[PDB]
């Protein structure tokens, strides 16, 4: 696959990047004679997250791990505007549709090339692309089928970008709502299900209500007084309560504002 020329430089030393016949990247370590789906630098970042296991409040612990991941991916440099420009240019607008590894790589390369021309040596493109691809497949393609839904890719990138919190909420709600701005239970379940994979991938889903988000959908609709559909304003008001399935996001913003 042509992208191998480009991304093979994301690894060095005794590591070697390889492609399974299914098109999925994996990493060979000739020193230890092993193979792993995770990029060695992703593994190193994850091992390090154990130094946050002392943090007492789970929403804060999760936000700090996600903040560290955000910075390792350079997604704290990414505005909502620029993320949308890359999504637009790659025609990623049918949210129920699949994108394979090459479409993920292409869209991430447009994002990271632009960040790189805007920032001085902060962005190693091949490395960023490969590591962000690795995070996105770990969140959304655990069995390495080689595809993820467009809505999933947007949920990951937008949730970790540097936009203001309400802009993220508005954007994300718009991705699941109908063309007239309306969200019913099924559609909200779509967003919460994609969002909850993020803390679930860090092994912290038990502090966010568990991996079944149906109880949170019902809670949102009961909060909306059992109306059949909701609009963006009501969803923002519900998020102001920091529902348990999503509280890691607002806390992430507080972690970032607190500096580190």
């Amino acid at each position: 696959p042509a992208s191998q020329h480009f991304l093979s430089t994301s690894v060095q030393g005794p590591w070697e990047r390889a492609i399974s016949p299914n098109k999925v990247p994996y990493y060979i370590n000739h020193e230890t004679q092993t193979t792993c789906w995770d990029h060695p630098k992703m593994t190193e970042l994850y091992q390090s997250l154990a130094d946050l296991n002392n943090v007492r409040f789970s929403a804060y612990r999760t936000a700090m791990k996600l903040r560290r991941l955000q910075k390792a991916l350079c997604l704290d440099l990414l505005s909502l505007s620029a993320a949308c420009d890359a999504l637009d240019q790659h025609n990623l607008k049918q949210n129920d549709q699949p994108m394979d590894i090459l479409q993920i790589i292409n869209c991430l390369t447009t994002i990271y090339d632009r960040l790189e021309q805007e920032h001085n040596n902060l962005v190693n493109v091949p490395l960023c692309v490969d590591m962000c691809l690795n995070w996105l497949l770990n969140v959304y393609d655990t069995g390495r089928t080689g595809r993820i839904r467009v809505l999933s890719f947007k949920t990951g990138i937008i949730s970790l970008c540097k936009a203001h919190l309400e802009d993220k909420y508005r954007y994300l709600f718009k991705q699941v709502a109908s063309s007239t701005g309306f969200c019913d239970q099924r559609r909200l379940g779509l967003l919460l299900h994609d969002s909850i994979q993020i803390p679930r991938q860090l092994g912290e889903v038990a502090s966010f209500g568990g991996s079944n988000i149906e109880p949170s959908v019902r809670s949102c609709f009961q909060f909306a007084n059992n109306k059949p559909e909701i609009e963006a304003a009501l969803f923002l008001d519900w998020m102001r309560l920091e529902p348990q399935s999503m509280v890691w996001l607002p806390v992430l913003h507080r972690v970032a504002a607190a500096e580190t």
């Binding site: 390889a18 399974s20 999925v24 994996y26 004679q33 193979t35 792993c36 655990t142 069995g143 390495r144």
Partner: peptide
């Protein structure tokens, strides 16, 4: 679903 986890190709010298 089912086979949410699978190993990568085995090491080959």
């Amino acid at each position: 679903n089912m086979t949410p986890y699978r190993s990568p190709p085995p090491y080959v010298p």
